Copies of this chain bind each other. A is one copy, B any other.
Amino acid sequence: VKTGSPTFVRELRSRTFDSSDEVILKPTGNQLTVEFLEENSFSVPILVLKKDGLGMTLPSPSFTVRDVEHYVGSDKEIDVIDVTRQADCKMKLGDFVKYYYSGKREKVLNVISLEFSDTRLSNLVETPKIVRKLSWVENLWPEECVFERPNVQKYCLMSVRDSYTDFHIDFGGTSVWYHVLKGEKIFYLIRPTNANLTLFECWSSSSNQNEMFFGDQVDKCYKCSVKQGQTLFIPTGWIHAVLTPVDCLAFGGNFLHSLNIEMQLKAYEIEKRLSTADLFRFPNFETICWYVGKHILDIFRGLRENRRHPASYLVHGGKALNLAFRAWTRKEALPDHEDEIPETVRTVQLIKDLAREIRLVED
């Protein structure tokens, strides 16, 4: 049985898996704050039932694929996946709209990466406040920087019934939020334990990858239905597949943050190796790491100047970052990383100082 085919989907549909209720947190919008995520950590998926308190702005649930076309443009080239889990290709949006309303489902076409930040649609959607507060690119990417800035904050997803996206780790080790405006999406979520990552890498490389349901190889594969008006936040590194059971229109975006830097670096390294994408959807990952390194040093200096202590998660994140910094700048690795280092950063000193501040904060 080939992954993505109609028989594969018919079978997937009848499966139950482990209940998402065993792992997800379900705060209200008002409860999902920075403090909440610092205290709770952001290590399991978070499903918010109603959008109230999330600080989003969205069109009404009456919004359509035709509307998307109007705000984005008929002529926009968009990446489409032919859900016979086969190929990628470009398509004019108007041609997709034609396919969509045609109702002809001989080919199952899925749109999941229409980034609309530079279109009129951008004015109609504001992302969750928590994301805007956490996001590295949003808060810590310097205006003066001359590197290409990642542009992955606003995606529109348009998925016909029976769309399937196979298990993957989100690009660049990012976390992601998804809001289903209409229809439903089913996420199959797997925790990125070292053990699961090993199985994932093995499966990603196996010759019969398209015939093996990854969720079967792990201890726990959690099924999470995200229905109309609901918002899902997936933490760094979580391995997941998505079945679209009914026609779905959704919005989402990808971000990096400081809550679990070790997991972020790890997810980044693994996905970089395993990805079959032709482009880095998150360019200059390392660059932003360097800037964050300096900012975290500043935080530690400040806390010490004021006789206060950092939260544990920051200490650990700063340490894992510093390990990465040393690895990227070793004599023999430097050639493959130098290009990503901002010309304003003195790496040897940043590393030395970070190490010092971190030593003055352990026990």
Interface residues, chain A, with chain B CB atoms under 8 Å away:
22-23, 25, 27, 31, 35, 38-41, 43, 191, 193-195, 198, 219-220, 262, 265, 269, 309-312, 316, 323-324, 327, 362-363
Contact = CB atoms under 8 A, between A and B. Distances in A.
B219 A39 contact: yes
Contact of A39 (B41, B193, B327): B193
Contacts of A219: 35, 39
Contacts of A27: 22
Counting every copy of the chain, the complex holds 2
Contact of A193 (B262, B265, B311, B363): B311
Contacts of A191: 39
* 4 shortest interchain CB distances as A-B pairs: A194-B311, A39-B193, A323-B362, A194-B312
Given A22-B25, A39-B191, A193-B312, 16 more contacts: A22-B31, A23-B40, A35-B219, A38-B193, A39-B193, A39-B219, A194-B309, A194-B312, A195-B311, A198-B309, A262-B312, A269-B363, A316-B316, A323-B362, A323-B363, A327-B363
Contacts of A39: 191, 193, 219-220
A313 B323 CA distance: 17
Nearest to A18: B31
Contacts of A316: 316
A20 B324 CA distance: 38
A23 B323 CA distance: 32
A309 B324 CA distance: 19
A235 B310 CA distance: 22
Contacts of A31: 22
Nearest to A314: B194
Contacts of A195: 311
A40 B43 CA distance: 9
A35 B219 CA distance: 9
